Amino acid sequence: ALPKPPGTPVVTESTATSITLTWDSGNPEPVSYYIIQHKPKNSEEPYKEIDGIATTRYSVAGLSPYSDYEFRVVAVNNIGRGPASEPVLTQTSEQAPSSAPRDVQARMLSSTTILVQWKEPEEPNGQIQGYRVYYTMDPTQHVNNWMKHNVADSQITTIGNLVPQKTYSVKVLAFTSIGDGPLSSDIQVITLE
């Protein structure tokens, strides 16, 4: 007869871009192979299908970081294709952001304070936990020797105690739990009233 549905698949490995599934055959007799059905959790469209999986374990790659996914497994034998299992829900791991905060802007508020603001990076790869604002009077320095101000998840901050009539270079990165993303390319702001 046709195969019965495989056992509900179990996620046993995950990375930022892959999910590894294992399942029970769900069947008394041997199965020829399996088909994995996968989609984003909140897609309302039909599952995509990976055909011809010859074992009861498979890693689905390259998915995107910090994303919700739905999977099912289908068994096939010589008679044909059985019903899909019950779905499993899961989520790929986070990464550091892989793009810079966008539209980074700064303007003078006084001779000693500026206003810095930006937009969220397009590629956060995770929950943004905060931003780090780098600023200096000498941008030839390594960024780790610039002055630094840490911020929570936000898009605007003020920075004070600046020396008047100076060009300050400013760079901003976002960070997730995993790590720091890239720095925006330098902008300049002058402490001139």
Numbering used by the authors: 328 to 520
Give the authors' words:
Vertebrate type-IIa RPTPs comprise LAR, PTPσ and PTPδ, which share common domain architecture with a single transmembrane (TM) helix flanked by a large extracellular domain (ECD) and cytoplasmic tandem PTP domains: the membrane-proximal PTP domain (D1) is catalytically active, whereas the membrane-distal PTP domain (D2) is inactive. In mammals, presynaptic type-IIa RPTPs form trans-synaptic adhesion by specifically binding to their cognate postsynaptic organizers through their ECDs for inducing synaptic differentiation of neurons. To date, five different types of postsynaptic organizers for type-IIa RPTPs have been reported: interleukin-1 receptor (IL-1R) accessory protein (IL-1RAcP)7, IL-1RAcP-like-1 (IL1RAPL1)8, neurotrophin receptor tyrosine kinase C (TrkC), netrin-G ligand-3 (NGL-3)1011 and Slit- and Trk-like (Slitrk) family proteins. To elucidate the structural basis for decoding the ‘splice-insert signaling code' in the type-IIa RPTPs, we determined the crystal structures of PTPδ-ECD in complex with IL-1RAcP-ECD and IL1RAPL1-ECD.
The following Fn1 and Fn2 domains are aligned in a straight line, similarly to the isolated PTPδ Fn1-Fn2 structure, which we determined at 2.0 Å resolution.
